[PDB]
């Protein structure tokens, strides 16, 4: 109507976090700052901090959000439990949920689908690990899953291999969180490539313990999948012999990436400089990029139609009237931004996306090339 107001949901903290509050705000500042003619509908981003990853709390938040009459519900960033409840509520209400984290639910396709996921799909990363391993001539790998939800995230990778000691075997972290017996088995069976998968911190723990068990040398290739890989900084774990490789989607060349990383650099020390700031973690960008996604599609629909927001109550089944239309317009939107190209397939996932690989060096990154979404691995 007169303000395309949308609703954040940030599972992240406000102190020493991925800074998503700041990034969503920066994007808002950048858009309502870029003055165009005629003077348009503003963009306001309403922000809702969520405490736990409990579906019950989320239902409370979404019932606190639907009255605000919001075009979409960004996030929740890293709460894969809460994601299915938001997606379920908004697929009930016909209001798009622009997911920014992965989905570790099974995600039945027959489920009510009106969700666009700016985050690389789990099949798509699985194919990237498959095709990096096809570049390394299929060594007898061994996958180190953090939780068991690794296996649902890297599902197609697993199926496409004769699971044994000789092609690919799965080990998982125990409840002790001490990977040293696992690396001792891996070193036992002469296992050349290790495919570590976790959040970024358990990634550091497997690598530091590995660096001490003397398993970071010239022979070992570690295809880390934790797609937060730009913020991992390793000291005493990275040698020029060492061959750790992650993926990262940031299009650093986009003009805003330097300035945004400066803004997220400023509001890191002020909350706390207790550790040095390891760089912009991915969810800041996906949120910054997604606010551009939803503003662009809503702006197009605001042209060919006129969209009214209605005080929607989770009690009454009143449905946003234009929702499936906005859905259609969202699935064709394209924005080239900090997260790279943002184009969506019919299934509501992301395609034509560039995961720029990194092989780490003694200080940082060496772009050893790109795994494209379609033309797979032109590295």
């Amino acid at each position: 109507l007169s303000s395309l107001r949308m609703a954040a949901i940030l599972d992240d903290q406000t102190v020493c976090g991925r800074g998503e509050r700041l990034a969503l705000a920066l994007a808002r500042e950048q858009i309502n700052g870029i003055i165009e003619v005629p003077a348009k509908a503003r963009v306001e981003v309403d922000i809702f901090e969520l405490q736990r990853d409990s579906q019950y709390e989320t239902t409370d938040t979404m019932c606190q959000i639907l009255p605000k009459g919001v075009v979409s519900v960004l996030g929740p960033s890293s709460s894969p439990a809460s994601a299915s409840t938001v997606s379920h509520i908004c697929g009930e209400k016909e209001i798009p949920h622009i997911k920014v984290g992965p989905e570790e639910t099974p995600r039945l396709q027959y489920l009510r689908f009106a969700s666009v996921s700016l985050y690389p799909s789990n099949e798509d990363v699985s194919l990237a690990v498959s095709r990096i391993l096809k570049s390394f001539n299929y060594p007898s790998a061994s996958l180190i899953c953090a939780k068991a939800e690794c296996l649902l995230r890297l599902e197609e990778l697993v199926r496409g291999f004769l699971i044994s000691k000789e092609t690919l075997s799965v080990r998982m972290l125990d409840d002790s969180r001490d990977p040293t017996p696992l690396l001792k088995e891996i070193r036992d069976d002469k296992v050349s490539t290790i495919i570590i998968d976790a959040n970024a911190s358990i990634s550091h723990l497997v690598l530091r313990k590995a660096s001490e068990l003397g398993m970071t040398s010239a022979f070992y290739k570690y295809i880390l999948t934790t797609m937060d890989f730009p913020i991992l900084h390793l000291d005493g774990i990275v040698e020029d012999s060492s061959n750790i490789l992650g993926f990262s989607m940031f299009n650093t060349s986009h003009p805003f990436y330097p300035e945004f990383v400066r803004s997220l650099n400023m509001s890191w020390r002020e909350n706390c400089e207790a550790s040095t700031y390891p760089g912009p973690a991915l969810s800041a960008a996906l949120m910054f990029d997604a606010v551009h996604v939803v503003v662009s599609a809503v702006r197009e629909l605001n042209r060919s139609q006129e969209i009214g927001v209605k005080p929607l109550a989770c009690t009454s089944a009143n449905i946003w009237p234009h929702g499936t239309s906005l859905m259609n317009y969202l699935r064709m939107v394209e924005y080239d931004g900090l997260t790279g190209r943002v184009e969506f397939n019919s299934k509501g996932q992301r395609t034509n996306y560039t995961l720029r690989i990194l092989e780490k060096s003694r200080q940082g990154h060496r772009e050893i090339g790109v795994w494209y979404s379609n033309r797979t691995l032109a590295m």
């Binding site: 409990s54 894969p80 439990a81 379920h88 027959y110 489920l111 009510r112 649902l152 699971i163 044994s164």
Partner: protein, 365 residues
Amino acid sequence: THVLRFGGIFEYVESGPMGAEELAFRFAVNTINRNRTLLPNTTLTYDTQKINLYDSFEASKKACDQLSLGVAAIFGPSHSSSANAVQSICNALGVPHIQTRWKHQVSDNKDSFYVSLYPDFSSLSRAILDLVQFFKWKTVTVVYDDSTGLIRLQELIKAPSRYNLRLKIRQLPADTKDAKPLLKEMKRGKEFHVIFDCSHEMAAGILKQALAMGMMTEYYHYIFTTLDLFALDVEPYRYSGVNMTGFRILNTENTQVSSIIEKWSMERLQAPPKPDSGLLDGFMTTDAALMYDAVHVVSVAVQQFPQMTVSSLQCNRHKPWRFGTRFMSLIKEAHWEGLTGRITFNKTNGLRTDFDLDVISLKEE
């Protein structure tokens, strides 16, 4: 004198007016009331709603409605997303949730006021591991329905790293019951031993397709995790010599078991499956059986606990239930020798991983 009510949140079934699980719940409360040994001074009332399938917002609305009416437990549902939604409502509101089918548990999810009753697929898959070694299989192929993740087979996937097993995982076509390209790949690969992991309604179809594709010979040995294997009909293939070997939890040896099974079947409560599918009649499937046990294990804990009554509980404006910790502990410490063997719970996570299985196999009879 005492009234005490349970809630149920069951699925919409096109099989008829009452689903198998729902029929069992309705049949269970009545059977547990008409027994005089158990809940003597009290009685049960049961508020059973239905939902559509995959409807987590409606399921959470239902659970808010029932808990606003005043319940002491919320049984069902079955599908994983609706299951998890009700779990979280209940965990904050303090009222014990007693699922029945295996849901996928999120490993973060710190919630404790839930108890499951399906024998948990970690330990069940560990049983399948002990079976693969007994037959000295070296090569096995696991075929899983996509709806269930490979997570319930996580011990089978960790298993090749600790023995010599050349696993290979293939996916049943989920959109179809017709898995012939898969089966032809399985045969050209000479994948003789297969661990099917699918609901038995899929398993009847897969076995039937197999006979047509001539994979039902005395070579193949098909292990099935589906705990309804005995309720599958095997007379089309009994003489073939295919060595199917599955698990079975129902205590059909015991006479109280076999008469309760008889009552449930000869009361026409179930809906007759047609002979096209190759499935059978008159069987209480495992799903329903666990439910008959579930009403009891909760009602045993009720009978042990005299002074709790229900109370009306609004969602998001009311405290944890004032009796939730007490009632939940008693549900977790109940040893009840039900239809599906003993029922007792691994007290860490409220799951169930102690249970006495019967391996069944296909002899020529």
